[PDB]
Amino acid sequence: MKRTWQPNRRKRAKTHGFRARMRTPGGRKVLKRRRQKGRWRLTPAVRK
Amino acid sequence: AVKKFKPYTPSRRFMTVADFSEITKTEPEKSLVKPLKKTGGRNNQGRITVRFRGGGHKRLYRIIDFKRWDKVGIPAKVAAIEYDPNRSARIALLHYVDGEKRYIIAPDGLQVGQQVVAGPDAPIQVGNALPLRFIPVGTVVHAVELEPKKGAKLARAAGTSAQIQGREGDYVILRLPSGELRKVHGECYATVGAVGNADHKNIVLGKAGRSRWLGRRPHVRGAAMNPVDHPHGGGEGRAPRGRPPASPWGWQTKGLKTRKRRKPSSRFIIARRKK
RNA sequence: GAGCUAGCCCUGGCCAGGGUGAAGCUGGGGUGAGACCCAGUGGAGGCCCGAACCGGUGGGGGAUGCAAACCCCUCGGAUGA
RNA sequence: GAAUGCCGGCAUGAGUAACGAUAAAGAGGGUGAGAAUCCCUCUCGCCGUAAGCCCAAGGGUUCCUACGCAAUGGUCGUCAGCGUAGGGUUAGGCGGGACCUAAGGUGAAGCCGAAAGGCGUAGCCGAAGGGCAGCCGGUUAAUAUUCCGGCCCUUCCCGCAGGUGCGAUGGGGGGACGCUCUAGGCUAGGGGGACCGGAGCCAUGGACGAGCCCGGCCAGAAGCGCAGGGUGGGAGGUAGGCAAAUCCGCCUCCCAACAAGCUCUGCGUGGUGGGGAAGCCCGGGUGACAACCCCCCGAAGCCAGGGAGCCAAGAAAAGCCUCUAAGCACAACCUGCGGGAACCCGUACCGCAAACCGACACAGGUGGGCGGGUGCAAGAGCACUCAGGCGCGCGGGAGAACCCUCGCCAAGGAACUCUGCAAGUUGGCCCCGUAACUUCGGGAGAAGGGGUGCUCCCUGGGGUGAUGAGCCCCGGGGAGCCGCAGUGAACAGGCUCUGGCGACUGUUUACCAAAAACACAGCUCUCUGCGAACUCGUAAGAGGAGGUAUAGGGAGCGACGCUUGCCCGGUGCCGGAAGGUCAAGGGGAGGGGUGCAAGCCCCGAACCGAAGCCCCGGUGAACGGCGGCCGUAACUAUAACGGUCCUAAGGUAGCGAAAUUCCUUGUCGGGUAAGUUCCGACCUGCACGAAAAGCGUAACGACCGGAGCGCUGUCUCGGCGAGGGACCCGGUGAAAUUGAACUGGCCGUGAAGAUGCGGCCUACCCGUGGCAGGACGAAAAGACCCCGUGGAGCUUUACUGCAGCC
RNA sequence: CGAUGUCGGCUCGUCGCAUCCUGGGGCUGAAGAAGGUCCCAAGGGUUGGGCUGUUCGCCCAUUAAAGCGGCACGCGAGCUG
RNA sequence: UGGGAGAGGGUGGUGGAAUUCCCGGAGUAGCGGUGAAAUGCGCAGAUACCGGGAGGAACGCCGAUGGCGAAGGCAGCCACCUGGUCCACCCGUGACGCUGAGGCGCGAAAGCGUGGGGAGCAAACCGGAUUAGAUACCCGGGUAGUCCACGCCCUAAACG
RNA sequence: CCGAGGGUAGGGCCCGUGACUGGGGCGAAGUCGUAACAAGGUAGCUGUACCGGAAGGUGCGGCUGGAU
Ligand SMILES: O=C(CCCC[PH](c1ccccc1)(c1ccccc1)c1ccccc1)N[C@H](CO)[C@H](O)c1ccc([N+](=O)[O-])cc1
Ligand SMILES: [Mg+2]
Ligand SMILES: [Mg+2]
Ligand SMILES: [Mg+2]
Ligand SMILES: [Mg+2]
Ligand SMILES: [Mg+2]
Ligand SMILES: [Mg+2]
Ligand SMILES: [Mg+2]
Ligand SMILES: [Mg+2]
Ligand SMILES: [Mg+2]
Ligand SMILES: [Mg+2]
Ligand SMILES: [Mg+2]
Ligand SMILES: [Mg+2]
Ligand SMILES: [Mg+2]
Ligand SMILES: [Mg+2]
Ligand SMILES: [Mg+2]
Ligand SMILES: [Mg+2]
Ligand SMILES: [Mg+2]
Ligand SMILES: [Mg+2]
Ligand SMILES: [Mg+2]
Ligand SMILES: [Mg+2]
Ligand SMILES: [Mg+2]
Ligand SMILES: [Mg+2]
Ligand SMILES: [Mg+2]
Ligand SMILES: [Mg+2]
Ligand SMILES: [Mg+2]
Ligand SMILES: [Mg+2]
Ligand SMILES: [Mg+2]
Ligand SMILES: [Mg+2]
Ligand SMILES: [Mg+2]
Ligand SMILES: [Mg+2]
Ligand SMILES: [Mg+2]
Ligand SMILES: [Mg+2]
Ligand SMILES: [Mg+2]
Ligand SMILES: [Mg+2]
Ligand SMILES: [Mg+2]
Ligand SMILES: [Mg+2]
Ligand SMILES: [Mg+2]
Ligand SMILES: [Mg+2]
Ligand SMILES: [Mg+2]
Ligand SMILES: [Mg+2]
Ligand SMILES: [Mg+2]
Ligand SMILES: [Mg+2]
Ligand SMILES: [Mg+2]
Ligand SMILES: [Mg+2]
Ligand SMILES: [Mg+2]
Ligand SMILES: [Mg+2]
Ligand SMILES: [Mg+2]
Ligand SMILES: [Mg+2]
Ligand SMILES: [Mg+2]
Ligand SMILES: [Mg+2]
Ligand SMILES: [Mg+2]
Ligand SMILES: [Mg+2]
Ligand SMILES: [Mg+2]
Ligand SMILES: [Mg+2]
Ligand SMILES: [Mg+2]
Ligand SMILES: [Mg+2]
Ligand SMILES: [Mg+2]
Ligand SMILES: [Mg+2]
Ligand SMILES: [Mg+2]
Ligand SMILES: [Mg+2]
Ligand SMILES: [Mg+2]
Ligand SMILES: [Mg+2]
Ligand SMILES: [Mg+2]
Ligand SMILES: [Mg+2]
Ligand SMILES: [Mg+2]
Ligand SMILES: [Mg+2]
Ligand SMILES: [Mg+2]
Ligand SMILES: [Mg+2]
Ligand SMILES: [Mg+2]
Ligand SMILES: [Mg+2]
Ligand SMILES: [Mg+2]
Ligand SMILES: [Mg+2]
Ligand SMILES: [Mg+2]
Ligand SMILES: [Mg+2]
Ligand SMILES: [Mg+2]
Ligand SMILES: [Mg+2]
Ligand SMILES: [Mg+2]
Ligand SMILES: [Mg+2]
Ligand SMILES: [Mg+2]
Ligand SMILES: [Mg+2]
Ligand SMILES: [Mg+2]
Ligand SMILES: [Mg+2]
Ligand SMILES: [Mg+2]
Ligand SMILES: [Mg+2]
Ligand SMILES: [Mg+2]
Ligand SMILES: [Mg+2]
Ligand SMILES: [Mg+2]
Ligand SMILES: [Mg+2]
Ligand SMILES: [Mg+2]
Ligand SMILES: [Mg+2]
Ligand SMILES: [Mg+2]
Ligand SMILES: [Mg+2]
Ligand SMILES: [Mg+2]
Ligand SMILES: [Mg+2]
Ligand SMILES: [Mg+2]
Ligand SMILES: [Mg+2]
Ligand SMILES: [Mg+2]
Ligand SMILES: [Mg+2]
Ligand SMILES: [Mg+2]
Ligand SMILES: [Mg+2]
Ligand SMILES: [Mg+2]
Ligand SMILES: [Mg+2]
Ligand SMILES: [Mg+2]
Ligand SMILES: [Mg+2]
Ligand SMILES: [Mg+2]
Ligand SMILES: [Mg+2]
Ligand SMILES: [Mg+2]
Ligand SMILES: [Mg+2]
Ligand SMILES: [Mg+2]
Ligand SMILES: [Mg+2]
Ligand SMILES: [Mg+2]
Ligand SMILES: [Mg+2]
Ligand SMILES: [Mg+2]
Ligand SMILES: [Mg+2]
Ligand SMILES: [Mg+2]
Ligand SMILES: [Mg+2]
Ligand SMILES: [Mg+2]
Ligand SMILES: [Mg+2]
Ligand SMILES: [Mg+2]
Ligand SMILES: [Mg+2]
Ligand SMILES: [Mg+2]
Ligand SMILES: [Mg+2]
Ligand SMILES: [Mg+2]
Ligand SMILES: [Mg+2]
Ligand SMILES: [Mg+2]
Ligand SMILES: [Mg+2]
Ligand SMILES: [Mg+2]
Ligand SMILES: [Mg+2]
Ligand SMILES: [Mg+2]
Ligand SMILES: [Mg+2]
Ligand SMILES: [Mg+2]
Ligand SMILES: [Mg+2]
Ligand SMILES: [Mg+2]
Ligand SMILES: [Mg+2]
Ligand SMILES: [Mg+2]
Ligand SMILES: [Mg+2]
Ligand SMILES: [Mg+2]
Ligand SMILES: [Mg+2]
Ligand SMILES: [Mg+2]
Ligand SMILES: [Mg+2]
Ligand SMILES: [Mg+2]
Ligand SMILES: [Mg+2]
Ligand SMILES: [Mg+2]
Ligand SMILES: [Mg+2]
Ligand SMILES: [Mg+2]
Ligand SMILES: [Mg+2]
Ligand SMILES: [Mg+2]
Ligand SMILES: [Mg+2]
Ligand SMILES: [Mg+2]
Ligand SMILES: [Mg+2]
Ligand SMILES: [Mg+2]
Ligand SMILES: [Mg+2]
Ligand SMILES: [Mg+2]
Ligand SMILES: [Mg+2]
Ligand SMILES: [Mg+2]
Ligand SMILES: [Mg+2]
Ligand SMILES: [Mg+2]
Ligand SMILES: [Mg+2]
Ligand SMILES: [Mg+2]
Ligand SMILES: [Mg+2]
Ligand SMILES: [Mg+2]
Ligand SMILES: [Mg+2]
Ligand SMILES: [Mg+2]
Ligand SMILES: [Mg+2]
Ligand SMILES: [Mg+2]
Ligand SMILES: [Mg+2]
Ligand SMILES: [Mg+2]
Ligand SMILES: [Mg+2]
Ligand SMILES: [Mg+2]
Ligand SMILES: [Mg+2]
Ligand SMILES: [Mg+2]
Ligand SMILES: [Mg+2]
Ligand SMILES: [Mg+2]
Ligand SMILES: [Mg+2]
Ligand SMILES: [Mg+2]
Ligand SMILES: [Mg+2]
Ligand SMILES: [Mg+2]
Ligand SMILES: [Mg+2]
Ligand SMILES: [Mg+2]
Ligand SMILES: [Mg+2]
Ligand SMILES: [Mg+2]
Ligand SMILES: [Mg+2]
Ligand SMILES: [Mg+2]
Ligand SMILES: [Mg+2]
Ligand SMILES: [Mg+2]
Ligand SMILES: [Mg+2]
Ligand SMILES: [Mg+2]
Ligand SMILES: [Mg+2]
Ligand SMILES: [Mg+2]
Ligand SMILES: [Mg+2]
Ligand SMILES: [Mg+2]
Ligand SMILES: [Mg+2]
Ligand SMILES: [Mg+2]
Ligand SMILES: [Mg+2]
Ligand SMILES: [Mg+2]
Ligand SMILES: [Mg+2]
Ligand SMILES: [Mg+2]
Ligand SMILES: [Mg+2]
Ligand SMILES: [Mg+2]
Ligand SMILES: [Mg+2]
Ligand SMILES: [Mg+2]
Ligand SMILES: [Mg+2]
Ligand SMILES: [Mg+2]
Ligand SMILES: [Mg+2]
Ligand SMILES: [Mg+2]
Ligand SMILES: [Mg+2]
Ligand SMILES: [Mg+2]
Ligand SMILES: [Mg+2]
Ligand SMILES: [Mg+2]
Ligand SMILES: [Mg+2]
Ligand SMILES: [Mg+2]
Ligand SMILES: [Mg+2]
Ligand SMILES: [Mg+2]
Ligand SMILES: [Mg+2]
Ligand SMILES: [Mg+2]
Ligand SMILES: [Mg+2]
Ligand SMILES: [Mg+2]
Ligand SMILES: [Mg+2]
Ligand SMILES: [Mg+2]
Ligand SMILES: [Mg+2]
Ligand SMILES: [Mg+2]
Ligand SMILES: [Mg+2]
Ligand SMILES: [Mg+2]
Ligand SMILES: [Mg+2]
Ligand SMILES: [Mg+2]
Ligand SMILES: [Mg+2]
Ligand SMILES: [Mg+2]
Ligand SMILES: [Mg+2]
Ligand SMILES: [Mg+2]
Ligand SMILES: [Mg+2]
Ligand SMILES: [Mg+2]
Ligand SMILES: [Mg+2]
Ligand SMILES: [Mg+2]
Ligand SMILES: [Mg+2]
Ligand SMILES: [Mg+2]
Ligand SMILES: [Mg+2]
Ligand SMILES: [Mg+2]
Ligand SMILES: [Mg+2]
Ligand SMILES: [Mg+2]
Ligand SMILES: [Mg+2]
Ligand SMILES: [Mg+2]
Ligand SMILES: [Mg+2]
Ligand SMILES: [Mg+2]
Ligand SMILES: [Mg+2]
Ligand SMILES: [Mg+2]
Ligand SMILES: [Mg+2]
Ligand SMILES: [Mg+2]
Ligand SMILES: [Mg+2]
Ligand SMILES: [Mg+2]
Ligand SMILES: [Mg+2]
Ligand SMILES: [Mg+2]
Ligand SMILES: [Mg+2]
Ligand SMILES: [Mg+2]
């Protein structure tokens, strides 16, 4: 049957992307925390 | 009259349609239609604030002239009478000797090819607009403003009309379609006659599909819900109301007056409605 | 977190084939004029049968499965909410 | 040493289940250390509205080639979507941007919020919508509307020539629109040809033939033809289209008008460029100087912004044309022609799947287009089959029980069972025929029956032609032939009588309930006069609604028919300027602390003082409620009648052992040989009853009852047969479980149900296929039940707050 | 209670005897035939339907007879539900 | 051809008295009701009086033993549309007539459907009296209805 | 070929009968009231509507076949 993950690149960039995080205070904290933890990827990779 | 159907489906048995016979033009004026943003009942927060709305036929909004004191003295021919999806009444297309074209809601008895005008000097004939302090006491009237220059607010639905009952100072006394007796300022404009399409109220929708075509989604009784949803929710099997009949939000819905008691309008409202 | 699901908004797309034969219109009959009657025309509908498509009625299978809801037979809707 | 402990390692179950659709395989030849599995040939089978082809998502080198087989691949592997390496994606015209807007998003101005931040007209962003200029063929191992070939076209820049009041982010026109139905003419695609081209064939009894088999086209500027779409011309007046305007709008006058003309598009033809089969021969050559013609069918596509009807009344902005303003009028723009200029990203390959979403090469899920032929009434259905693609990544044997999927069955025919569950029967088309009842539509495919193939002969109308031939389409009437059987295979209702519930079509518990539940048209009550009520938000702002009482909100009821009684004492709501109670505040008789004093400070009665509550009244489609005892009539029985208690008032019409009835399988009637069910009745209704509506109701129902006809392996009562497993051999090889085990019966005992204690009995060691009685078998720290001063959801006239409102 | 699945049916049985039948007896208010009652006896047998989920029971038609109990109200790692 | 009377019908308008309700004034101890009463209304200011407004229905005197229509039935006043009937002239037509099974139309009240309207009245209903009782007569309330449009119903002591 | 009739299926009319139910007639020796005939103690009758144990009442309109 139809499952939960139905990939869509515009939906991925506009929802989790860098510019979406920078707008909101909670999004900037998500980046602050991922940068503090030393994450290699601050946001998901989307091919555009 | 209203048109019946032979009972060749279960729903055509009672379905009834407007006869659409006063209509002479089946297409809207292009410069007078703008797109109507469908809301679905949602507000600028994205939240439903009026339940069971949406999914109705697409519509263009026809611009209606609710001032008319715009063009005092300039007459206009009644060029056509049109269907309007955004209101119960029909709309009349006006051709001005100015060259300007406009829309008004069609009074009962308007004739294509008739001349109408608006002003302190206008004849007291169906379709003409005047300040209230010039329409003779007794004549029925519609498209009445509530305050000078603010636009026609009363008696705009199909078949509705208000009657002038007298004059007191700068104010005339109106009987609104509700039966309320209201002081309205004498300098508020109005259009002599009643609104047309009075057979609107005898229309039988006929089936659930017709309600849906109108943007009215199915309404659900509180009695059919659960206590998290409605005061009338829960119960084992069917249940009586077991409390004063209430709205989804708890306030009582059988008799409780809700007009604001200190509203300044009270100084101008003579008698609460009837029926 | 509405890339699953629920509702709404904007913009596109899809629904083989066959059956029934409403209003109306035309002709004829009818009458003072009508109602109305017959015929031809017409092509209506949350109309009928049935694929796609949407479903999920009953039974059987499956039950460390092909599958964390599947399979076969049967069955409901299919111009409409 | 135990924590169903944590991490890791390794056992047991076990050579066991399984190895992922029952579409299917066989042999020959190669390669190689190794072959059921790789490559090649021949035979067989499967898909063919796909299991074939193209496109968008998503995936990200999976593409091609060489060299490889440790792992990955459910076996194998010499193969591969795997390992290493090299190569491969070419655009002004295809898609996106350097264009336009939609919802939405952002947001100068502006508004709001403790902060963070929420809004917000214009503007900007935003597409699979609008707009915009490329077709056919060839080429590579791998790209091609991109390279090449042929024929076309768009924009920008500059120049030349002609022409014009030129000029815009401003004005206007246009762009610009729904659903259903549909005309004419085309094309896509298709069938036929006794005609045109072609390598060949004459088998096995016949056929050298109007024989068999193969093919008979594709693109194409200007011009022309055919079919359509779009568009009236002139003059005068003008106060409107936030300036101007010659444009547009309005008024009047005159020729024009279903015409033409002007304009645009589609199709045809078209200079020219291409392509081109079977067969044979080793993707290529040949066939071939290939032929490339006629007839028929014909779209859902095209002309298109066509036509008609209907009501629910069907985007925007730019490109474009026009109008003018500043300006500029040696410029500027328009038209033609010429030269120059033309950027960025994508392009491989998978794409109904082994490359996407599902942990897997997973029987599941995934949007758009093309989707041939014959036959069956049609069709995208069904059977076969073309092109194309496959035989599903374990095999070989065997012929047990048992399982699954399937086929048949004597006599009987529902005797099965909770129930005809299931499976039969029925089945398409044509004709004949068809009931109660009904809202006159229906019920209706009612029911029930007859016909159905092939041959010959006569013949009626239509389409295309031409009016004829031919082709194609819809019929009729005869006379015959064969079989058990003519919708000869596949696809395609069993039916009827009678109750319950819901009017109906719909909707729902994704993943145990599809219903009688929800919704539904319709009915009523109620709120709301518009800065509406109401809803979301602290607010601004929004929805309501660019709506205005024939409207919007809330509630109940639920098509329709006939109806909807009594109780306003309690609760609710509505009305009530009197009275009673009432907080802050006002007021200050009087009383107190202190200082020597003026003074300062505190307490404080009357009286004044809102809403609310008390009080008076209204109100039931508001919350709700709607009795008991005694007595009485020519026999019995009963009680129309009377009496009396209590209440706010004592259930009216209708209905009733009912989706309601405890006693209960009430009693009687009907059906049956037999009826706890079903239908019809009666009424001592435990415990119906009138919008939590009452009683009915045609039609409808994958709803739930009862009966019958038809027919059946449901059954009496079982038998045989088929394939896939089960079994055996070769290959790979799990799992829950598991204190350890050297793990028998009885009668007893034992924490009360013993392989493990006592007595007796029985018993050589170890497996394989089988059955399920035990190991209080496995699974899940019992859902029931209780307990915990454990939790959470819900309710209220529990308590105490809060918002909101007054 | 870190689980002993619960009514009825189907299938498959097995056992007790306080015996329903068939066999053998005593007494009878046993003439015969047919019964009553008690004793002995568990080898075998002990039907088919209608109603209800039913166990049970009623009823139809038969019968030599249409027995009653136990086995976790025998039996859901056997099925049914 | 000429003239007359008439509540004959249909449509649209308009006049005044009265009842009820609400607003203002003024005023206070009852009003109302009956055979007599009570329920009811009234110090929350009623009744009686004055001014204003709103709304519906019916049209006083004329009015009469009257008039008109086929009947049912028709009554303020204006107008429009329209039917029947009578008289005088004796002009035209030349038996063109009478009746009438079926048919068609009309048809008081009440009743029905859809939608308006709703002052007075008033079934049902509630209360007070009367009474042996009083599901009645009488009194206080009061919903359909009575009114308008359209469509049904088609009855009567529709009688002379 | 037709064909007595038989068979299947669906209809129409009539007759007998049926748990129970509706009113009607007659019987008279009852219980309740008194609707009508007098102004019958509320003049009566009437079509219709709603209502009440019962005769009946009331509303709306109509008739005199109404006493004074
Ligand atoms: O409780 C049970 C077992 C209940 C199992 C019903 P379940 C199931 C579970 C495992 C295996 C088979 C069946 C189920 C029940 C609850 C949760 C999950 C599964 C089920 C399945 C299908 C349909 C109905 C029930 N036995 C307890 C011993 O602990 C005890 O013997 C017992 C006590 C009281 C009664 N008594 O009659 O009162 C009967 C039996
Ligand atoms: Mg996942
Ligand atoms: Mg999707
Ligand atoms: Mg992904
Ligand atoms: Mg995307
Ligand atoms: Mg996208
Ligand atoms: Mg997206
Ligand atoms: Mg983003
Ligand atoms: Mg790094
Ligand atoms: Mg992130
Ligand atoms: Mg109708
Ligand atoms: Mg019709
Ligand atoms: Mg009609
Ligand atoms: Mg119907
Ligand atoms: Mg119409
Ligand atoms: Mg109209
Ligand atoms: Mg009209
Ligand atoms: Mg339109
Ligand atoms: Mg526009
Ligand atoms: Mg708008
Ligand atoms: Mg809007
Ligand atoms: Mg917004
Ligand atoms: Mg938001
Ligand atoms: Mg709301
Ligand atoms: Mg809504
Ligand atoms: Mg309208
Ligand atoms: Mg209308
Ligand atoms: Mg309506
Ligand atoms: Mg609508
Ligand atoms: Mg509604
Ligand atoms: Mg509802
Ligand atoms: Mg519920
Ligand atoms: Mg919630
Ligand atoms: Mg709550
Ligand atoms: Mg609540
Ligand atoms: Mg409740
Ligand atoms: Mg309840
Ligand atoms: Mg409930
Ligand atoms: Mg209940
Ligand atoms: Mg419930
Ligand atoms: Mg309920
Ligand atoms: Mg319910
Ligand atoms: Mg209730
Ligand atoms: Mg309740
Ligand atoms: Mg209650
Ligand atoms: Mg105001
Ligand atoms: Mg769209
Ligand atoms: Mg369809
Ligand atoms: Mg026809
Ligand atoms: Mg027509
Ligand atoms: Mg439908
Ligand atoms: Mg349909
Ligand atoms: Mg259908
Ligand atoms: Mg199913
Ligand atoms: Mg089945
Ligand atoms: Mg089966
Ligand atoms: Mg399936
Ligand atoms: Mg299937
Ligand atoms: Mg449907
Ligand atoms: Mg169907
Ligand atoms: Mg269809
Ligand atoms: Mg220890
Ligand atoms: Mg363990
Ligand atoms: Mg451990
Ligand atoms: Mg561990
Ligand atoms: Mg070991
Ligand atoms: Mg084993
Ligand atoms: Mg497996
Ligand atoms: Mg091999
Ligand atoms: Mg090998
Ligand atoms: Mg090969
Ligand atoms: Mg095919
Ligand atoms: Mg991947
Ligand atoms: Mg490639
Ligand atoms: Mg590669
Ligand atoms: Mg390998
Ligand atoms: Mg290997
Ligand atoms: Mg492997
Ligand atoms: Mg391997
Ligand atoms: Mg695998
Ligand atoms: Mg090798
Ligand atoms: Mg591979
Ligand atoms: Mg290479
Ligand atoms: Mg190019
Ligand atoms: Mg550029
Ligand atoms: Mg833009
Ligand atoms: Mg675009
Ligand atoms: Mg392009
Ligand atoms: Mg081209
Ligand atoms: Mg290439
Ligand atoms: Mg110009
Ligand atoms: Mg538009
Ligand atoms: Mg469009
Ligand atoms: Mg449609
Ligand atoms: Mg063809
Ligand atoms: Mg030939
Ligand atoms: Mg042509
Ligand atoms: Mg002008
Ligand atoms: Mg060639
Ligand atoms: Mg050559
Ligand atoms: Mg040649
Ligand atoms: Mg089509
Ligand atoms: Mg059109
Ligand atoms: Mg409409
Ligand atoms: Mg816009
Ligand atoms: Mg200038
Ligand atoms: Mg020019
Ligand atoms: Mg650039
Ligand atoms: Mg490419
Ligand atoms: Mg598939
Ligand atoms: Mg596809
Ligand atoms: Mg999975
Ligand atoms: Mg595989
Ligand atoms: Mg798959
Ligand atoms: Mg093709
Ligand atoms: Mg067929
Ligand atoms: Mg067919
Ligand atoms: Mg099919
Ligand atoms: Mg073929
Ligand atoms: Mg295979
Ligand atoms: Mg074997
Ligand atoms: Mg199979
Ligand atoms: Mg056989
Ligand atoms: Mg048989
Ligand atoms: Mg039978
Ligand atoms: Mg039989
Ligand atoms: Mg049954
Ligand atoms: Mg029948
Ligand atoms: Mg009929
Ligand atoms: Mg129907
Ligand atoms: Mg048939
Ligand atoms: Mg039937
Ligand atoms: Mg044959
Ligand atoms: Mg088949
Ligand atoms: Mg069939
Ligand atoms: Mg069928
Ligand atoms: Mg029936
Ligand atoms: Mg019912
Ligand atoms: Mg239901
Ligand atoms: Mg239903
Ligand atoms: Mg109904
Ligand atoms: Mg329904
Ligand atoms: Mg479910
Ligand atoms: Mg569930
Ligand atoms: Mg679940
Ligand atoms: Mg669930
Ligand atoms: Mg369900
Ligand atoms: Mg269903
Ligand atoms: Mg539901
Ligand atoms: Mg419902
Ligand atoms: Mg209703
Ligand atoms: Mg709020
Ligand atoms: Mg706002
Ligand atoms: Mg608003
Ligand atoms: Mg708005
Ligand atoms: Mg509104
Ligand atoms: Mg309903
Ligand atoms: Mg409902
Ligand atoms: Mg009826
Ligand atoms: Mg009460
Ligand atoms: Mg009360
Ligand atoms: Mg009271
Ligand atoms: Mg209460
Ligand atoms: Mg006082
Ligand atoms: Mg003092
Ligand atoms: Mg002192
Ligand atoms: Mg009630
Ligand atoms: Mg009521
Ligand atoms: Mg109470
Ligand atoms: Mg209630
Ligand atoms: Mg007695
Ligand atoms: Mg009762
Ligand atoms: Mg009563
Ligand atoms: Mg009963
Ligand atoms: Mg019974
Ligand atoms: Mg019942
Ligand atoms: Mg009950
Ligand atoms: Mg009980
Ligand atoms: Mg019972
Ligand atoms: Mg019982
Ligand atoms: Mg019994
Ligand atoms: Mg039963
Ligand atoms: Mg009884
Ligand atoms: Mg309720
Ligand atoms: Mg109920
Ligand atoms: Mg109720
Ligand atoms: Mg249904
Ligand atoms: Mg159903
Ligand atoms: Mg069998
Ligand atoms: Mg066989
Ligand atoms: Mg086999
Ligand atoms: Mg076999
Ligand atoms: Mg040991
Ligand atoms: Mg024991
Ligand atoms: Mg023991
Ligand atoms: Mg032992
Ligand atoms: Mg031991
Ligand atoms: Mg030992
Ligand atoms: Mg010992
Ligand atoms: Mg021992
Ligand atoms: Mg032994
Ligand atoms: Mg065992
Ligand atoms: Mg066991
Ligand atoms: Mg053991
Ligand atoms: Mg056990
Ligand atoms: Mg478990
Ligand atoms: Mg635990
Ligand atoms: Mg526990
Ligand atoms: Mg527990
Ligand atoms: Mg307990
Ligand atoms: Mg405690
Ligand atoms: Mg404690
Ligand atoms: Mg709690
Ligand atoms: Mg409120
Ligand atoms: Mg336990
Ligand atoms: Mg355990
Ligand atoms: Mg003897
Ligand atoms: Mg004897
Ligand atoms: Mg003895
Ligand atoms: Mg003895
Ligand atoms: Mg024995
Ligand atoms: Mg024995
Ligand atoms: Mg029993
Ligand atoms: Mg015998
Ligand atoms: Mg036992
Ligand atoms: Mg047990
Ligand atoms: Mg027991
Ligand atoms: Mg027991
Ligand atoms: Mg047991
Ligand atoms: Mg058991
Ligand atoms: Mg079980
Ligand atoms: Mg059991
Ligand atoms: Mg077992
Ligand atoms: Mg066990
Ligand atoms: Mg069972
Ligand atoms: Mg059950
Ligand atoms: Mg009024
Ligand atoms: Mg008089
Ligand atoms: Mg007279
Ligand atoms: Mg003469
Ligand atoms: Mg009448
Ligand atoms: Mg009234
Ligand atoms: Mg009494
Ligand atoms: Mg009534
Ligand atoms: Mg009524
Ligand atoms: Mg009436
Ligand atoms: Mg008379
Ligand atoms: Mg015979
Ligand atoms: Mg009397
Ligand atoms: Mg009398
Ligand atoms: Mg009584
Ligand atoms: Mg009365
Ligand atoms: Mg009369
Ligand atoms: Mg007399």
Residue numbers in the entry:
A (entry chain 17): 1 to 48
B (entry chain 1D): 2 to 276
Task: Give verbatim excerpts from the published study on this entry.
To understand the functional relevance of the introduced TPP moiety of CAM-C4-TPP in the context of the bacterial ribosome, we have determined the crystal structure of CAM-C4-TPP bound to the Thermus thermophilus (Tth) 70S ribosome at 2.80Å resolution. In this experiment, we used Tth 70S ribosomes complexed with E. coli protein Y (PY) as a tool to obtain structures of higher resolution. A single binding site spanning both PTC and NPET of the large ribosomal subunit was observed for the CAM-C4-TPP. Consistent with the drug design rationale, our structure confirms that the amphenicol part of the CAM-C4-TPP molecule anchors it in the PTC of the 70S ribosome, directing the attached C4-TPP tail towards the macrolide binding site in the NPET. For example, the phenyl moieties of the TPP group form π–π stacking interactions with nucleotides A2062 (edge-to-face), G2505 (edge-to-face Figure S3C,D), and C2610 (parallel-displaced) as well as Van der Waals contacts with nucleotides A2057, A2058, A2059, and U2611 of the 23S rRNA. This interaction results in rotation of the nucleobase of A2062 by ~160° around its N-glycosidic bond into a position where it forms a Hoogsteen base pair with the residue m2A2503. Similar re-orientation of this nucleotide was observed previously in the ribosome-CHL structures, as well as in structures of ribosome-bound amino acid derivatives of CHL and macrolides.
The majority of antibiotics suppress pathogenic bacteria, and thereby cure infections, by selectively inhibiting their ribosomes—molecular machines that are responsible for protein biosynthesis. Chloramphenicol (CHL) is one of the oldest and the most well-studied ribosomal drugs that target the catalytic peptidyl transferase center (PTC) located at the heart of the large ribosomal subunit (50S) where peptide bond formation occurs. As with many other PTC-targeting antibiotics, CHL binds to the ribosome in the A-site cleft, a crevice between the bases of nucleotides A2451 and C2452 of the 23S rRNA, where the aromatic nitrobenzyl ring of CHL establishes π–π stacking interactions with the nucleobases of A2451 and C2452. At this location, the ribosome-bound CHL competes with the amino acid side chains of the incoming aminoacyl-tRNAs (aa-tRNAs).
